[PDB]
Design a protein around this nucleic acid. Structure first.
Length: 67
DNA sequence: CCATATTTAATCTTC
DNA sequence: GGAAGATTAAATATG
């Protein structure tokens, strides 16, 4: 019988964090879990934040792909 | 197959 | 106002 809990604060990426994600995206848009773990450790972000960033990046590039 | 994980598509939300 | 981070259920992928 759980109450409705609020959302986590929206992540505000630093420039170094975003550059780390973009550089990995360049070699694969779908990092395996080991890579997501490595990226989480290098950025200090949670593995979920890492996964979601790639999710959202893929959605963005998919729309652009048809111009 | 079957349980679990990941991804997709769509959207809600906020910086 | 607009890009994008966070969430959701469904679909697809994986072991």
């Amino acid at each position: 019988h759980m109450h409705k809990r609020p959302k986590r604060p929206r992540t505000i990426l630093t420039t170094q964090q975003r550059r780390a994600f973009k550089a990995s995206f360049e070699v694969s848009s779908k990092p395996c879990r080991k890579v997501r773990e490595t990226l989480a450790a290098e950025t200090g972000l949670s593995v979920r934040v890492v996964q979601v960033w790639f999710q959202n990046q893929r959605a963005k590039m998919k729309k652009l792909a048809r111009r």
